């Protein structure tokens, strides 16, 4: 017969930790056999993505390429949503402030216009940067896709 006490004890620690941690990580195991050349460029609207779908099998074979394409386009749409909305509002200010500064640079430099342009640009840039989409890298989206 087999010996299985150690691996069951180790697996229980991972399950217990995952029970009390929101975003606990897991180890990675993979295997690329000699049958990966068949998938060289040879699903009911999948919607929910979880970290337990990569534990279906230890071997990469056949359909894993198709799910990769489905996953990739989902990331692209997520980035598009992040690219729109309120990020455009600060973008609208920033270019205009730069344009205003450029205008202040022109017309033989006209304080007054220069002071107003500098103050508005500094205030808007500082306010936009302060939020930084919560915690900067926490926004992911564009950074993961790039």
Residues in touch with other proteins (CB under 8 A): 12, 15-16, 18-19, 34-35, 37-38, 45, 47-50, 52, 74, 77-78, 80-81, 83-84, 92, 95-96, 99-100, 103, 107, 113
Cβ proximity to other proteins, 1 vs 77, nearer residue: 77
Q: How far apart are CA 89 and CA 146, in angstroms?
A: 23
How many other CB atoms are found less than 10 A from the CB of residue 145?
13
Q: How far apart are CA 62 and CA 38, in angstroms?
A: 8
Closest distance between other proteins and the C-beta of residue 83, in Å?
7
Closest distance between other proteins and the C-beta of residue 106, in Å?
9
Closest distance between other proteins and the C-beta of residue 18, in Å?
6
Q: Is the dihedral of CA 51, 57, 60, 61 positive or negative?
A: negative
Q: How far apart are CA 139 and CA 79, in angstroms?
A: 10
Cβ proximity to other proteins, 22 vs 130, nearer residue: 22
Closest distance between other proteins and the C-beta of residue 49, in Å?
5
Where would I find the H helices in the chain? 5-20, 64-83, 86-109, 113-131, 142-145
Cβ proximity to other proteins, 76 vs 130, nearer residue: 76
Cβ proximity to other proteins, 9 vs 15, nearer residue: 15
């Amino acid at each position: 017969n087999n010996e299985l006490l150690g691996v069951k004890k180790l697996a229980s620690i991972y399950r217990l930790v995952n029970k009390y941690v929101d975003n606990a990580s897991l180890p990675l195991m993979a295997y690329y056999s000699i049958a990966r050349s068949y998938i060289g460029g040879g699903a009911k609207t999948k919607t929910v993505w979880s970290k337990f779908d990569v534990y279906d099998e230890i071997e990469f074979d056949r359909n894993d390429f198709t799910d990769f394409f489905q996953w990739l386009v989902f990331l692209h749409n997520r980035a598009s949503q992040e690219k729109l909305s309120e990020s455009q509002t600060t973008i609208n200010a920033l270019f205009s402030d730069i344009q205003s500064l450029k205008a202040t640079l022109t017309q033989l430099s006209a304080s007054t216009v220069i002071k107003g342009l500098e103050l508005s640009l500094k205030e808007k840039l500082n306010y936009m940067k302060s939020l930084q989409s919560g915690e900067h890298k926490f926004n992911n989206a564009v950074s993961l896709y790039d």
